[PDB]
Amino acid sequence: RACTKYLSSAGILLLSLLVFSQLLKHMVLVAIDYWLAKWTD
Amino acid sequence: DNFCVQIIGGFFTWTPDGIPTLSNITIRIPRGQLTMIVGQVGCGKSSLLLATLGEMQKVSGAVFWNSSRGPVAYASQKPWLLNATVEENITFESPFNKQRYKMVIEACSLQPDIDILPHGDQTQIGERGINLSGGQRQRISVARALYQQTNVVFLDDPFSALDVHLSDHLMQAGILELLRDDKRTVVLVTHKLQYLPHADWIIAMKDGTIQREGTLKDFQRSECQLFEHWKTLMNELE
Amino acid sequence: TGLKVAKRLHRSLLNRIILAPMRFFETTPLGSILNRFSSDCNTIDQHIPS
Amino acid sequence: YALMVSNYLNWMVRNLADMEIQLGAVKRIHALLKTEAESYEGLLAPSLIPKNWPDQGKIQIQNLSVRYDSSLKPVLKHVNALISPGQKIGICGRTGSGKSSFSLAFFRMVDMFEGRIIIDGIDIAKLPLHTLRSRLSIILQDPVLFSGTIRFNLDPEKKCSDSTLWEALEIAQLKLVVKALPGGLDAIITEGGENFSQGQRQLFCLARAFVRKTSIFIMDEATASIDMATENILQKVVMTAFADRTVVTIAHRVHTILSADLVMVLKRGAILEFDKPETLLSQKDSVFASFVRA
Numbered sequence A: 001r002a003c004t005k006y007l008s009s010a011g012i013l014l015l016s017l018l019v020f021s022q023l024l025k026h027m028v029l030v031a032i033d034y035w036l037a038k039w040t041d
Numbered sequence B: 001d002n003f004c005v006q007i008i009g010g011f012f013t014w015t016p017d018g019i020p021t022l023s024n025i026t027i028r029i030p031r032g033q034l035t036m037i038v039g040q041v042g043c044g045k046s047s048l049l050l051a052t053l054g055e056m057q058k059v060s061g062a063v064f065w066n067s068s069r070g071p072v073a074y075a076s077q078k079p080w081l082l083n084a085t086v087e088e089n090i091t092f093e094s095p096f097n098k099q100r101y102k103m104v105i106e107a108c109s110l111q112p113d114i115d116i117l118p119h120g121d122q123t124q125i126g127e128r129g130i131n132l133s134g135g136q137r138q139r140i141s142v143a144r145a146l147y148q149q150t151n152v153v154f155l156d157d158p159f160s161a162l163d164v165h166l167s168d169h170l171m172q173a174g175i176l177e178l179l180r181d182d183k184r185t186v187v188l189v190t191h192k193l194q195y196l197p198h199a200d201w202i203i204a205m206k207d208g209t210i211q212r213e214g215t216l217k218d219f220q221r222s223e224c225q226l227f228e229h230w231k232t233l234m235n236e237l238e
Numbered sequence C: 001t002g003l004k005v006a007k008r009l010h011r012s013l014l015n016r017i018i019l020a021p022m023r024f025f026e027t028t029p030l031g032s033i034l035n036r037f038s039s040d041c042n043t044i045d046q047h048i049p050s
Numbered sequence D: 001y002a003l004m005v006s007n008y009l010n011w012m013v014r015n016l017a018d019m020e021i022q023l024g025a026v027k028r029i030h031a032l033l034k035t036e037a038e039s040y041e042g043l044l045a046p047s048l049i050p051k052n053w054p055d056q057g058k059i060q061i062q063n064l065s066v067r068y069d070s071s072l073k074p075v076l077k078h079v080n081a082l083i084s085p086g087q088k089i090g091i092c093g094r095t096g097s098g099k100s101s102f103s104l105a106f107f108r109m110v111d112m113f114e115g116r117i118i119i120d121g122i123d124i125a126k127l128p129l130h131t132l133r134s135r136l137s138i139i140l141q142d143p144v145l146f147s148g149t150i151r152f153n154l155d156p157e158k159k160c161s162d163s164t165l166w167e168a169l170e171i172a173q174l175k176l177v178v179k180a181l182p183g184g185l186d187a188i189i190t191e192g193g194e195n196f197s198q199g200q201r202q203l204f205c206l207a208r209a210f211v212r213k214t215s216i217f218i219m220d221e222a223t224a225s226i227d228m229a230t231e232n233i234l235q236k237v238v239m240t241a242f243a244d245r246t247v248v249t250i251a252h253r254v255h256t257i258l259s260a261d262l263v264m265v266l267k268r269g270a271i272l273e274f275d276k277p278e279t280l281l282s283q284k285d286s287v288f289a290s291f292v293r294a
């Protein structure tokens, strides 16, 4: 509808790429901090 | 003294440092009388009206007010309407006085218009309100000018958007009756020459200067060409 | 994403306004139409992608 | 990561509230985006339309009744008239008699819920709106000017030469005024034409219509803001310059249409009288005679 105009104007590919890339970047940062915790022990 | 406005040698410019749009302006508007400014297109009429009000930069001459100008009831050629209602536009920061309000409504013949619209006399006007006809905008602006208790009324073409009957009734009931009984200075820029017999004073303008300033008996002898030209336009102008 | 939506929404709004009838322009105030180009478009171009 | 919760829980809630406010702006733009559009397609084929479909300017009006919206009072009721090509039609009546909606009916700016306007054998409801509105010229009573040069206001698409623009300005009594300006045709008109008078703005709009050089002119109370002296010479030069063109002149002053071929008197949206002014003024009880006498 009117609230979902931004998602339809962005398109499925660009919006899904944004969400997937942000999620992958933050899980990579979590993995870096976990490996730092394992390294410091 | 016996005059309301007076200009001696007034040179006025719209631009800051340009050619004077008005030159050698010499007017003697009487008080309590009807002064009519007549001329062609772009000949200085609205410019003279705003040069008395101080809205235009003066290069030379003097402007005298014997009314320290004070308020002047002004109806611009383009009608200006506030975002408030019909009643608030006509009253325009004034006490209500319903007996005068009915007379101003009947003089402008705005009574059939307020018998239409979703909330008559209370409908929002202008931006964020209902759109009016151009004649209705003109008559509400003129009703604002006629309603106030101001000694000076300035009207700049109030009959441009109106037909014959509305202009005739506004001329008779509004200008010749409502304004005359208050002994009110009326300065009326018009292109309708049929109302020249109802004028106490006539200021003729031509290319941003005062061509001739006087009564109709003065124009019968001082300016024979312009008098006969007026008679040709409207088919002995007493 | 911000550039793409900012281009497409203004193009669609400008093309849909000029085809709307004059009854719509008389009924709706011009401030309501113009504020979409002024403020809402400014949010979509600048504030939303941040 | 707990310190990041303490820093970012507030930032997440703040950005969520902000994002709701931003989606409000997107919502307003979409609500304006779903507004209905006029039907510019047209039922008639573009090949059926000739290159000059107002070939001579004949106008037939058959049982026309127009309104502005559904469930609204028809501002014209059963209008029926014929206009031979090259004829001058003066339209007169009191304010509110539907005579500006008559002018808007030829451009399909009003809801013609019944009746037809056949121009040169072609119903205009079958035509595209750009096709209909590009071959006809109208002069509104209220002038509308845009910021830019005089050349841009007269010819925004730059489809006409300087001689055509000067002829349009000379007919509209603006040759001396525009020539006195130092730019000439490049003289800047401000927003709304505030550097010109009301009469000069309206003469600029008249010259804006004189550039187009169509076959049917519809002058809807054009000379209302103009003084009588220059209105008479403007009317004379418009009559001489557009002698072969059908002109529908709506009269702010009735004495201007005393030389017209036919006079349409409108009373409350109905054509009460449609005849020559010489026969119309011969009748003592005719309303057009009351317009001329008073």
Ligand SMILES: Nc1ncnc2c1ncn2[C@@H]1O[C@H](COP(=O)(O)OP(=O)(O)OP(=O)(O)O)[C@@H](O)[C@H]1O
Binding pocket: B014, B015, B021, B040, B041, B042, B043, B044, B045, B046, B047, B048, B077, D194, D195, D196, D197, D198, D199, D200, D225, D226
């Ligand atoms: N606001 C303005 N800024 C600059 N020039 C102006 C302005 N108003 C008028 N002029 C110019 O000054 C001259 C006088 O215009 P003015 O306002 O006196 O018109 P007017 O006589 O009331 O016109 P009309 O009777 O056609 O409505 C014109 O040549 C016009 O181009």
Ligand SMILES: Nc1ncnc2c1ncn2[C@@H]1O[C@H](COP(=O)(O)OP(=O)(O)O)[C@@H](O)[C@H]1O
Binding pocket: C026, D068, D075, D093, D094, D095, D096, D097, D098, D099, D100, D101, D102
């Ligand atoms: N934009 C509009 N929307 C709705 N009704 C309108 C509009 N313009 C005019 N009308 C109606 O048309 C009638 C006047 O017709 P109009 O052609 O304006 O007469 P005139 O030509 O004498 O000004 C009025 O009663 C008014 O209600």
Ligand SMILES: [Mg+2]
Binding pocket: B045, B046, B047, B077, B156, B157, D197, D198
């Ligand atoms: Mg003026």
Ligand SMILES: [Mg+2]
Binding pocket: D099, D100
């Ligand atoms: Mg009208």
